[PDB]
Design a protein around this ligand. Structure first.
Ligand code: D2S
Ligand code: TH7
Ligand code: ZN
Length: 257
């Protein structure tokens, strides 16, 4: 019964999920002046040309666009990663106001939202096994700022009315996640966790430096979603983000000078 309210939000999660106070929790603040350029990192390869989206689901915490991951149709390779990581889903975290909503921060700056493209390491055979491994997932994080509209987001925005409440899903075929990427793949990377319960410490984070711009109308449509199920008191799905957690004994590496 975890959530994002005062009574069940991030400050409470550690009681059911003690790993919340673990050594590699996410998100973190990215201090750009202490992250170090790593010339050892190989180029990042985002290969999404054969992606097969299936469905979109309101799970009561966010909405997930879900992909067919039964073959290497959309994969992430390179950068800090060894081997091949398959796209399974993406989701966002966002705010009630344009000045908050992201999970990662950059020199303490909060963006309006943050996209998480979730990929699992194919050496572990499926997602459920991958999340039990320290290198099981690679999550590509992309910041959203409010400005110009993002055409590649509009198909997502326009289906949200059909999944307003928790447990609702809809068909969502033929969506191209390449339309959600910025021009540059410059990134920061560090080892961390899921930012929601169960908070598993299985993620190589790859957070892009360049935000995408989305329009005020696009983000407003995210804010009309509901945390509740149909036939329950309405609580708007906003501020579904966890604040920054202690970096502890981790280093953030940059792919760029
Ligand atoms: O092999 C597949 C199994 C499940 C899905 S649903 S996405 C999905 C994946 C992980 C989640 O914790 C939540 C999600 O909604 C999928 O797309 C493929
Ligand atoms: O970032 S929160 C989060 C939740 C589920 C997941 O499979 C991956 C994630 O990174
Ligand atoms: Zn997330």
């Amino acid at each position: 019964h975890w959530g994002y309210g005062k009574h069940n939000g991030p400050e409470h999660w550690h009681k059911d999920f003690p790993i919340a106070k673990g050594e590699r929790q996410s998100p973190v603040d990215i201090d750009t002046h202490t992250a170090k350029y790593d010339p050892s990192l190989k180029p990042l390869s985002v290969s999404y040309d054969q992606a097969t989206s299936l469905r979109i689901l309101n799970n009561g915490a966010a909405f997930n666009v879900e992909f067919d991951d039964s073959q290497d149709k959309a994969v992430l390779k390179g950068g800090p990663l060894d081997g091949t990581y398959r796209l399974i889903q993406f989701h966002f975290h966002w705010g009630s106001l344009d000045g908050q909503g992201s999970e990662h921060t950059v020199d303490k700056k909060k963006y309006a939202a943050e996209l998480h493209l979730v990929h699992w390491n194919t050496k572990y055979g499926d997602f459920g096994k991958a999340v039990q491994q320290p290198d099981g997932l690679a999550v590509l994080g992309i910041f959203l700022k409010v400005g110009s509209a993002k055409p590649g987001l509009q198909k997502v925005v326009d289906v949200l009315d059909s999944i307003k409440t928790k447990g609702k899903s809809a068909d969502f075929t033929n969506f191209d996640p390449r339309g959600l990427l910025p021009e540059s793949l410059d990134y920061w990377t560090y080892p961390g966790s899921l930012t929601t319960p169960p908070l598993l410490e299985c993620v190589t984070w790859i957070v892009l430096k360049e935000p995408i711009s989305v329009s005020s109308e696009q983000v407003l449509k995210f804010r009309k979603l509901n945390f509740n199920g149909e036939g329950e008191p309405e609580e708007l799905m906003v501020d579904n983000w966890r604040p920054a957690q202690p970096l502890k004994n981790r280093q953030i590496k940059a792919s760029f000078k």
